[PDB]
From a paper:
[name] is an obligate bacterial predator of other Gram-negative bacteria, exploiting adaptations that allow consumption from inside the prey cell periplasm. The [name] protein appends the C-terminal GGDEF enzymatic domain with an N-terminal forkhead-associated ([name]) domain, known to be used (in other proteins) for interactions with phosphopeptide ligands. [name] comprised a ~30aa tail, 100aa [name], 20aa linker and 160aa GGDEF domain. We provide the molecular basis for initiation of c-di-GMP production, demonstrating that the stimulus is a phosphopeptide tail present on the [name] GGDEF synthase itself.
To resolve this issue, we obtained 1.87 Å data on a new crystal form (tail-[name] only, lacking the GGDEF domain) comprised of residues 1–135 of [name]. In this new form, four [name] domains comprise the asymmetric unit, with each monomer arranged at ~90˚ to the neighboring domain. Upon imposing crystal symmetry, it is apparent that each monomer contacts a symmetry-related molecule in precisely the same manner as chains A and B of the full-length [name] structure (mediated through D56). Hence it can be inferred that the [name]:[name] contacts in full-length [name] are not dictated by constraints imposed by the GGDEF domain. For one of the [name] domains, difference density was observable at the putative phosphopeptide-binding cleft (next to consensus residues S75, R76 and T96). Our high resolution data allowed us to unambiguously model this density as residues K13-S19 of the previously disordered N-terminal tail of [name]. It was not possible to assign the tail as originating from a specific chain (chain B, C and D [name] domains are all close enough to span the distance to the bound tail). In agreement with assignment of the [name] domain as a putative phosphothreonine receptor, the interactions between the tail and [name] cleft centre around residue T14, which is conserved in homologues of [name]. The [name] cleft makes three hydrogen bonds to the tail (involving R61, T96 and N97), which binds in a linear conformation across the apical face of the [name] fold. Aligning the N-terminal tail from a representative group of [name] homologues reveals a pattern of conservation across a seven residue span (−3 to +3 with respect to the central threonine); our structure underlines the importance of the +3 position (V17), which points downward into the cleft and is a crucial recognition feature of the peptide substrate in other [name]-based sensory systems.
Author numbering: 13 to 19
């Protein structure tokens, strides 16, 4: 699965 970026 794809990482979630920092927001």
């Amino acid at each position: 699965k794809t990482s979630i970026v920092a927001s």
